[PDB]
A paper describes a structure:
Here, a series of new methods are presented based on the use of a low X-ray-background film as a crystallization support and a photoablation laser that enable the automation of major operations required for the preparation of crystals for X-ray diffraction experiments. In this approach, the controlled removal of the mother liquor before crystal mounting simplifies the cryocooling process, in many cases eliminating the use of cryoprotectant agents, while crystal-soaking experiments are performed through diffusion, precluding the need for repeated sample-recovery and transfer operations. The [name] system enables the automation of sample mounting and cryocooling and can contribute to closing the automation gap that currently exists between crystallization and X-ray data collection.
These crystals grow from solutions that typically require the addition of cryoprotectants when mounted manually. Femtosecond photoablation lasers, such as that used here, produce little or no collateral damage to the sample owing to heat conduction or shock waves.
Numbering used by the authors: 1 to 206
The structure:
């Protein structure tokens, strides 16, 4: 499956793509404002994620740091990134279909649209100004709006017992972005697409 990752932000981002224990394609790359990076993701990838990283520094070897979404200091991510990270999430070729969503379970850093480029399902978008509106207790000094699990480390925010409900903090993300997951047991906003669809993730779509 091909994913075209497009940076429509006025600022440079460093895209990242991983299934948690491995890079997807190169794993990461710089995208200046307006640049497009096409990656190939193996069919049947389960639990894949694409995100943006902000305010990164990398040396010649591809090691450094990002203010948001840092993946162990690597340009070429092989693991998931450090919150806050708006997440484009996908499991492909799962019994004939692909499944896509946007999640704010790990916070929000950059606005995102995640849409098919092929026929047969709709896209999802979280493009509201979540950083600017972020509750004070969730604001990431590094930049971004953390989720409440990251900040407070409770069973209720992290849904550790599988019994949690919505919270004042999850309802903030949900209000700004109804089409993204706001907490682990949120009513799903997952979209069913044709198996072997192709996609585009646009940062700052508006």
């Amino acid at each position: 499956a091909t994913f075209e990752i497009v940076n429509r932000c006025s600022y440079t981002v460093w895209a990242a793509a991983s299934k948690g224990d491995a890079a997807l394609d190169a794993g990461g790359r710089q995208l200046n404002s307006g640049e497009s990076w096409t990656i190939n993701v193996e069919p049947g990838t389960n639990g894949g994620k694409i995100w943006a990283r902000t305010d990164c520094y990398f040396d010649d070897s591809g090691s450094g740091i990002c203010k948001t979404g840092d993946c162990g200091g690597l340009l070429r991510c092989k693991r998931f990134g450090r919150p806050p990270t708006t997440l484009a999430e996908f499991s492909l070729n799962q019994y004939g279909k692909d499944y896509i969503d946007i999640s704010n379970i790990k916070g929000f850093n950059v606005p995102m649209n995640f849409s098919p480029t092929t026929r047969g399902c709709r896209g999802v978008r979280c493009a509201a100004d979540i950083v600017g509106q972020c509750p004070a207790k969730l604001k990431a000094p590094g930049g971004g709006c953390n989720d409440a699990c990251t900040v407070f480390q409770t069973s209720e925010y992290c849904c550790t017992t599988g019994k949690c409900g919505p919270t004042e903090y999850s309802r903030f993300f949900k209000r700004l972005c109804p089409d993204a997951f706001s907490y682990v047991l949120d009513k799903p906003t997952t979209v069913t697409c044709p198996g072997s669809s192709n996609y585009r993730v646009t940062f700052c779509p508006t």
